[PDB]
Amino acid sequence: IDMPENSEMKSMKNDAFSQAKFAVENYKFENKISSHIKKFFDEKYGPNWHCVVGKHFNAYVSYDSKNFIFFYEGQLAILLYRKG
Amino acid sequence: QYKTFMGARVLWPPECADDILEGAIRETQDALKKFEIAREGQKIAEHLKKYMDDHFDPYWHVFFGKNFGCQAVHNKNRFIYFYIEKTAFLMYQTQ
Amino acid sequence: YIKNRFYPSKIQKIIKELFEDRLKGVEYDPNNANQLSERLVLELREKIKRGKVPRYKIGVQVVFGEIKGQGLRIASKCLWDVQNDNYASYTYTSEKVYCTGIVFGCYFE
Amino acid sequence: EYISEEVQKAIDDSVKQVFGIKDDSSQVTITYNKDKVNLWTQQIIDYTIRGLNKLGKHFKYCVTAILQQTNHAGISVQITAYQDTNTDGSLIQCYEINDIYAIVSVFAMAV
Amino acid sequence: PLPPHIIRFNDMAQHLLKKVIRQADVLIKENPQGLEKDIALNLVKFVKSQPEFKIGDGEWQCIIGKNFGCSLTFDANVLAFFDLLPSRKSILLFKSG
Amino acid sequence: NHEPEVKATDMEEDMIKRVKEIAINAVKEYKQEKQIAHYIKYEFDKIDGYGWNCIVGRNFGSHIIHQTKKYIFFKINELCLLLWKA
Amino acid sequence: AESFILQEGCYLLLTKEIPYFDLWNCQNDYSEKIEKMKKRILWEPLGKQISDELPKNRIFVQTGRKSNYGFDIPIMQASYYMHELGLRIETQRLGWFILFFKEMKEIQITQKMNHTWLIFKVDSNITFNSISKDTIALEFTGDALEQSFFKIKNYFEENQIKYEYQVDIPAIFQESQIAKKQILNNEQFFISYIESKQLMILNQMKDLKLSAYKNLYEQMQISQAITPVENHIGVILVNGSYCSGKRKFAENLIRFGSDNNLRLHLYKFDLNEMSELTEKSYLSGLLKFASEKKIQNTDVIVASVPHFINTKILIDYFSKSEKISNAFYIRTIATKININNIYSNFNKNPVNNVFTYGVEGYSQFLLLDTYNNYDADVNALNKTLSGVLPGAKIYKIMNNILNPALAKDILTSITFISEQNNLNRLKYSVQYDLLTSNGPSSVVFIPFKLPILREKIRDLIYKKILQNG
Amino acid sequence: INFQDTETRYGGIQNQVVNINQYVQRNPNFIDLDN
Ligand SMILES: Nc1nc2c(ncn2[C@@H]2O[C@H](COP(=O)(O)OP(=O)(O)OP(=O)(O)O)[C@@H](O)[C@H]2O)c(=O)[nH]1
Secondary structure (H helix, E strand, O other): OOOOOEOOOOOOHHHHHHHHHHHHHHOOOHHHHHHHHHHHHHHHOOOOEEEEEEEEEEEEOOOOOOEEEEEOOOOOEEEEEEOO | OOEEOOOOEEOOOOOEOHHHHHHHHHHHHHHHHHHOOOOOOHHHHHHHHHHHHHHOOOOEEEEEEEEEEOOOOOOOOEEEEEEOOOOEEEEEEOO | OOOOOOOHHHHHHHHHHHHHHHHOOOOOOHHHHHHHHHHHHHHHHHHHHOOOOOOEOOOEEEEEEOOOOOOEEEEEEOOOOOOOOOOEEEEEEOOOOEEEEEEOOOEOO | OOOHHHHHHHHHHHHHHHOOOOOOOHHHHOOOOOOOHHHHHHHHHHHHHHHHHHOOOOOEEEEEEEEEOOOOOOEEEEEEOOOOOOOOEEEEEEEEOOOOEEEEEEEEEOO | OOOOOEEEEEOOOHHHHHHHHHHHHHHHHHOOOOOHHHHHHHHHHHHOOOOOOOOOOOOEEEEEEEEEEEEEOEEEEEEEEEEOOOOOOEEEEEEEO | OOOOEEEEEOOOHHHHHHHHHHHHHHHHHOOOHHHHHHHHHHHHHHHOOOOEEEEEEEEEEEEOOOOOOOOEEEEOOOOEEEEEEO | OOOEEEOOOOEEEOOOOOOOOOOOOOOOHHHHHHHOOOOOOOEOOOEOOOOOOEEEEEEEEOOOHHHHHOOOOOOEEEEEEEOOOEEEEEEOOOEEEEEEOOOOOOEEEEOOOOOEEEEEEOOOOOOOOOOOOOEEEEEEOOHHHHHHHHHHHHHHHHHOOOOOEEOOOOHHHHHOOHHHHHHHOOHHHHHHHHHHHHHHHHHOOOOOOOOOOOHHHHHHOOOOOOOOOOOOOEEEEEOOOOOOOOHHHHHHHHOOOOOOOOOEEEOOOOHHHHHHOOHHHHHHHHHHHHHHHOOOOOOEEEOOOOOOOOHHHHHHHHHHOHHHHHHOEEEEEEOOEEOOOOEOOOOOOEOOOOOOOOOOOOOOEEOEEOOOOOHHHHHHHHHHHHHHOOOOEEOOEOOOOOOHHHHHHHHHOOOOOOHHHHHHHHHOOOOOOOOOOOOOOOOOOOOOOOOOOOHHHHHHHHHHHHOOO | OOOOOOOOEEOOOOOOOOOOOOOOOOOOOOEEEEO
């Protein structure tokens, strides 16, 4: 229902979905999931990212423009954004 | 083992400075108590991060709720993680 | 069993206000330097007498000198259980002076 | 159940064995260096505490050290404790070779 | 009283630094938007002007940043590096050796 | 990982290549900013006398001078390396 | 038809980038039926889903052993059209084809690749059934991912047919050749070999048999190195034409005891022997020094060769003479060039052997000495030297001053013994030819004890120099 | 727990001013600064 945006052309927006859904099935604890998403996105694009996973949580963060992606993945919610 | 503190359950040995810790520990239940309730969401964490940026160093992130979990890099010795009455609170700084 | 505990920021403050108001940008006169240390060391000890730490044991130490295009290293190492015993320290330098005080703490038991 | 003179002997053993050389030529070949000072400080303290742990005494120690480059600046070193009359104590020592002015300050406390 | 600040590393006599602080603060207010080029340009062209600051081996350099690291063969007399607390800009001033 | 690339430069060809080689070696060897700058500075102080200056980072701007044929600013994998003489 | 080069061991096909096999489709009759698919009527096995266009998508048809030979079917560009149970693929090269979701035997998908892929197997392939090996990979890109790949995934769930994830790169992508050039995104070794054999033949037709074969390729993978000889003596020479300023540089070097060598033996000259030296007597001189000082094996020597002796016969004697090799070996060779002494005459002309002492094989390092020289001229010279000598380590000294890092780099670095330079120096025998004569007539010395007013020295330096032409 | 006691001591070091070869500042010095 909510989809905060990022850069154009689906360089990044397209990548995150495809990766997240390998991630959700392949593990059970959030630890390996968030670690896996962050560990991939550091190698591909940028030097320091931040990721959150869960069914329910409040949050409010500072970041770099057009690098904030938030999406409801299945029952879970996944949050991702660069910083640093 | 989540040792008890006069605020709430905090994982020890602490990975944050004592003054910063005490500030967080007292501000959370003060700010909850005075004119704030559990029904409201974002407008808490709003105030918490504002309070930290006013006095302490400028760049903070706050995450709290009833279920989540994260890995994250952060400035050295600037990690606050605590439960209070089955509610997880997490905060950290980045340059 | 340690209900009351030693925290670094308190002594950090305490030494902070002691040093500036007492030193007041003084110069390094040889005839009085050693004994300058003697007054303010005991003054310090008096302050930590009201530092609110019953069993923590207080091995004060001070350094006082003049900087003259001069390189210096001062460092220390500890032997204590982290859960209880802890330390604190402060430095303070003007254009030609430097005074630095370290305070130990060991919970008696 | 100790004697502080023996503590001083152990410290002297450490410092002399580590850098101190009987023939006085290499200690001029080893002057104060900006690069090497860190290794020297950490190595001195580590070897000294190794010597201190060779002692099986149940007492409880702590260490401090100072390295001054030249005599011109001058310095004051002072101790003041709050401890036991019977067993507790402290110790100091000053040390010199050619252009290195070293000091050690130790505290020994019971339990 | 000076505007508040943090001295990470200074080597010139304090008065030179005081002048630097006052001008830098008023300028940073004067140019609160744009690029840090302009801050460097204006700061140099002021600093290059005064009959003070007479002695120079090479000549003036001013660098601004929020994240970097550096190695510099500065002239042994003059070098400064500090930060302006409202904005937290790490500002570096020296003469080329 | 990727090769370097000059975003702004003033050098001769043979001298562009040497800084290429040394930047790759420096990043392969050390892992910290002041260490990188210190190493490159030493290498070009060995090869061309005294008076090199180098600033490495991710966020900075500059007003400087140099000798006319001795300035370069190039980027490697989102790292901005600036180098100049005098 | 084809055109190639064939040298000795291997050959090079000049034209390989043109694919051996390619085709196009010239029959529209069947494609027209698919092309025109009216909307309002539907046919069940396809479904009815609507997708405007899915451009920029790639199709790979796998080929087996024939691909390794160089015969392969190329990668097609294509777009897709989606329906509830089928997929209408538009290939630019081959037309409109139909994919039903029952044909797939096994399934894999990969997150490793830069774009998301979908591999599967089908019994009957679209192309010639004879050559193909009946596995098909379809890439998805851009909007296709959200629009198609994920809907197909839902279909797989509902049927419970097994879908697998492959972490590593698929084997078939590694098997082929066009696969290699599309996943990535030798000849210079060929060129180096040809020029190497040209130079070796230039040395001597009879003696140009160092490797002269596939053993040369074993030198390509000779990167890893190791060598160290104990109980011997490491010499660090210093070449340089006359009036290059080598003696005092060597003395500046010997003062470096700080490094981990710590003990090193000077070599000391004086001018009166210096007149009467010869290549042969040199060797005896070093042996005499070794006996005189009772030198241990660890320590090293700093000897400064005059200009008149020629290093070629010296290396000949190092390798040939028994005793010398029994107790001596060469660490490294340094050199010297002076900008002020570059030219022999006022008309541009070079003094003897300036740009032949720096050859890559024989002299490791090249140093410039400059005093009171404008910077621009020095830089121009830098370019000329780099041009004359293809590869050399050029530094810059100002009036014989040593950076301590340079001193460490010189003193501790032994690389001359390494076999790589041992073949390199043979590659460059023709260029490093030095001709010089030593004799009573070539160089002479005259003792003289008397005082001299300076004006007539100016008479000499003016008249003899201007009229020397 | 009443555990009063007190002590003192002093270190110090020899004094000597040479001032013959004195007062060098290596003029083209180098340092390494970061943020
Ligand atoms: N005074 C002066 N020195 C120079 C000049 N050009 C170069 N030099 C320096 O002086 C040295 C020149 O060497 P020479 O004057 O030929 O005498 P040398 O140093 O004994 O050289 P060798 O005869 O080979 O041993 C160089 O190494 C430079 O360091 C110049 O124009 N004037």
